[PDB]
Every structure is written in structure tokens, then in C-alpha cells.
Amino acid sequence: MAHHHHHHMGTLEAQTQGPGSMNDYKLFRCIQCGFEYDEALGWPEDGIAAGTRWDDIPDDWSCPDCGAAKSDFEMVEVARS
Ligand SMILES: [Zn+2]
């Protein structure tokens, strides 16, 4: 009769989120879903490099999360002070 059991390992923090805000970068949050973009973090999945400004981001660029437009983003001030 088997009496072996497994235990849950718990939480492995694989995120480690934290962009170094050494320069005043902004946040841009999609209003259609809540996708928050940090200019200091960038989005390497699309090719957006860390430090790329919203102005440098192509007008044809869409929210990688849902395909919402740039006008679907809000400019969020960074309270990391
Ligand atoms: Zn979105």
C-alpha cells in the first residue's frame, strides 16, 4: 500500500520586476485591459528597448496584450520617489 506523499514547494518568485528609474520615465497603461508599460523597462518581446520613449514607439504599434492602439494608453506618472 502506497503511503508516499508530495509537498508543495510554495512560491517561486520568477517575476523580479523592478525597472531602474534613474531617469524620469513614464508609465503607459492600456485602458482596455490594464497593460502597464514602463518606458524604463521597455518591451523586448516586441523589440522595444529599455529606455525607448513613447515618441520613439511606432504609431502602428499596438498593445501586445490585446492589440489596442496607442490612444488606448494612459500616461501614468511615476511615484517612485
Ligand atoms: Zn491593452
Domain boundaries, the chain: 18-81
Amino acid letter at 39?
E
Residue 63, Cα to own-chain centre: how many angstroms? 11
8-state DSSP, 39? T
The 3-state DSSP class for residue 27 equals strand
Four-point Cα dihedral 60, 66, 70, 75, nearest 10:
-150
Rg (CA), the chain: 18
CA of 5 to the centre of ligand 1 (A): 42
* Assigned architecture for domain 18-81: Single Sheet (2.20)
CB atoms within 10 A of CB 13: 6
Q: Which residues contact 58 (CB under 8 A, 6 or more apart)?
A: none
| Experimental technique behind these coordinates | NMR
H or E element, residue 41: none
Residue 28, Cα to own-chain centre: how many angstroms? 9
CB atoms within 10 A of CB 18: 10
The 3-state DSSP class for residue 70 equals helix
CA of 37 to the centre of ligand 1 (A): 10
Q: What DSSP line would sit under 17-56, residue for residue? A: -----SS---EEEETTT--EEETTT-BTTTTB-TT--TTT
CA of 1 to the centre of ligand 1 (A): 52
CA of 30 to the centre of ligand 1 (A): 5
